[PDB]
Amino acid sequence: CPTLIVMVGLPARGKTYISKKLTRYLNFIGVPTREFNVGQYRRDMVKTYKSFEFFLPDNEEGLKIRKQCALAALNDVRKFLSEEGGHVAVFDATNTTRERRAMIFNFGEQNGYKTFFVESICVDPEVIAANIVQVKLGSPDYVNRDSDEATEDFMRRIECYENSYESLDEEQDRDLSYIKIMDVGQSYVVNRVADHIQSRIVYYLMNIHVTPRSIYLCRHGESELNLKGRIGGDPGLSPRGREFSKHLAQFISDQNIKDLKVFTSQMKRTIQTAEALSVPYEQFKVLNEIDAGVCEEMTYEEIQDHYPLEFALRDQDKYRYRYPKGESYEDLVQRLEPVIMELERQENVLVICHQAVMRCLLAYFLDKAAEELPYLKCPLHTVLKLTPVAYGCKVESIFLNVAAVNTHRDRPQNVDISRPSEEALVTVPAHQ
Template sequence: TSPEELPCLGILPLPQNRTTTTMKPKQISESWASYMTNSPTLIVMIGLPARGKTYVSKKLTRYLNWIGVPTKVFNLGVYRRQAVKSYKSYDFFRHDNEEAMKIRKQCALVALEDVKAYLTEDSGQIAVFDATNTTRERRALILNFAEENSFKVFFVESVCDDPDVIAANILEVKVSSPDYPERNRENVMEDFLKRIECYKVTYQPLDPDNYDNKIVYYLMNIHVHPRTIYLCRHGESEFNLLGKIGGDSGLSVRGKQFAQALRKFLEEQEIADLKVWTSQLKRTIQTAESLGVTYEQWKILNEIDAGVCEEMTYAEIKEQYPDEFALRDEEKYLYRYPGGESYQDLVQRLEPVIMELERQGNVLVISHQAVMRCLLAYFLDKGADELPYLRCPLHTIFKLTPVAYGCKVETIKLNVEAVNTHRDKPTVKQLPQEPNPCKDEKEQLYASVQFEYSKASKKLQCWEPAPQAPQPSPCPGHARRGRPAEDPSQHSGGVTVCLPPVLASCPCH
């Protein structure tokens, strides 16, 4: 099979706005989960320099990590700069520069070895190989590597023929590249355009195949047009004053003052074509109504469902449901309120919002504390451990401006007092554990049977276990913490671990 016949994510013209049919979140999540747990996946970027490959790689990686799929970018330029300490000119990229070609191929092989280590030893699920990969020969090498290691492969080609966009990309990103320490804009532009010409000599485009994948759905929604996203919570509510969570109370006096202050702020900013989104709860709607602009209500922007704990204070929850209170402090991201949601559930619910935000221009999202944490975690590339504890104070605006490979964040306080609803991450004490057949006399044995694969000696070496991302498990109590039970025969993690018979018979391992 040639690389051109592999599953392909398609050719992505940049920049271009795309319209797409909204997919139901449940269908997306189920198909994605069943696909992603089969085997590690290697996403291979393809395209001439200054076509947005690194931009796409970083955004895609941030998104996949946000939805709980461990993903890492491997940028070949980093490996090349480590091998060649000083870059002189575009001559290094000439196809007839045999010495340089050998160095570039060796760098690719080293990078692929790191990809292998990440996907087989470090519990990674997806590796993004960010390089030009413009020849069939290079793609065949990658394909053979993937087949030898039983990795799935997707090729993603980024195409742009607009000279203005290419020039803007060079000036915005390449001028500050380590390749050009002198930062001379004219010299950088001249050299980089010649570098592109070197690649064009051997460039062999990829033929598109199928588009039936969630990654495509995400990539087709991102664009590079300048825009700003504003995130804020509703004005202070009556329940905020009482320390109650959830519910559907209206704004307090100070909450209404914030709504007026927000209107004044937006008028001063003179934001072109600003769209305003709210949840369907009273406190966000009342905040938006004071702005004097059209706004859209999104049910999926509603606050996290606290189930039986709705409209209770934390003190009341601790008194009436002490076990639930302790469990949530122990594992806040995965914990699911009885009859309610977990942060993990909320992230899945908010996926369509992220898709739409990536398509849009200037947007103001008026939401709630947990919802805003999830959205902010996506744009700031924060993991599950940090997400539930991000500070999102009332009466504060987060101004997010997407830049080349990340997001610039500004916080703007509108000088209207409000209560503090933030709870710091607690120091968790060891909780009594529910009966579990995996523990008791087997517990110490399991703790000692961890391994590290040594490339040099091919031996198993004992080491202290590193924390891993939570995996679904049929153990008692896990479903209560937001982890559904599954068929033990389908259980899979990031690494295959050989366990002794006493543990191998346990469905949890």
């Protein structure tokens, strides 16, 4: 049974924001998910937005056209789940009345899906006001329009929905599966989680927030094996690694971060990097570097020499293929799910980790495809500062002024099984 997530709420309540975070998350953990924004369908269908009168609850023609856009969206939901193999579909619209919601419920039923509602509630004017400026004035409907007329139009637009707005009821809607998010995620009301995926969705939603903050990611300072061009193992810091550690501490101090939380793996290179700071930290083995199995501590030359077959396959699909007895980046993604969850729950946080692990975390907050994730560039002695924003995440690369070996290997042009060794190792960085 695929899952149909139905967003519910007045305009400017963070529905699209939640829809996006949920869709990205579900896709990260490998559940084919796609969001369907009725507003975008309308925009593609209506061409240009004039004013709120289109949304008047007593505007029969408008309602008609509005119903048509919803249906167009629902039809693609059906195609995705029923014809393209999608697992979850997020239907993003106001869906503020019992009527529409029952209609959508019926759709799910006739199509064989399980329906779950996510209602976002906000009665706070400064937040609503903040949301308008922050996301609405810049949106397509209002770009190239005067801020004040745009703002008035939108408020009048929200008004169109108030008289008919029927929130999920404990008794009237007791048979529906749903979650109601209030106070921007302060409190929640949950009813009838029907299964495992809904339980994980609720778990996810209850742990996300919009409290301003930055996520800092950096690798342990250069290690002894990094110098040798050797992967994995449990090396200690190299002289430069130690230098970096001191540059990181100064950076962290200079940052003057409010209540920063610092995490490291259980590998000495990250811990030794963490020892350099003023602030305390927590070590978690879940943050340990990807396991290379039989090629642990080997150099790429050695790997090509002993595992030419596995090395070629891994290059062909570096997300899915692994070395014998090792993890794939896919296994690592699965392994990092708890990390992703706690990072969402966290506020200001610094994670001192490793190349593969950092690529996984960057891919998550930067919404990078699985195919692209194994190749993201995570240079040594550089801090990547992430500032989650509406629908996206800004990133800043901050070099901490300490030389370091390059551990980034590009995918060689030749990835054919039985490829000459020279072509296999052509993209290997300098070392020793």
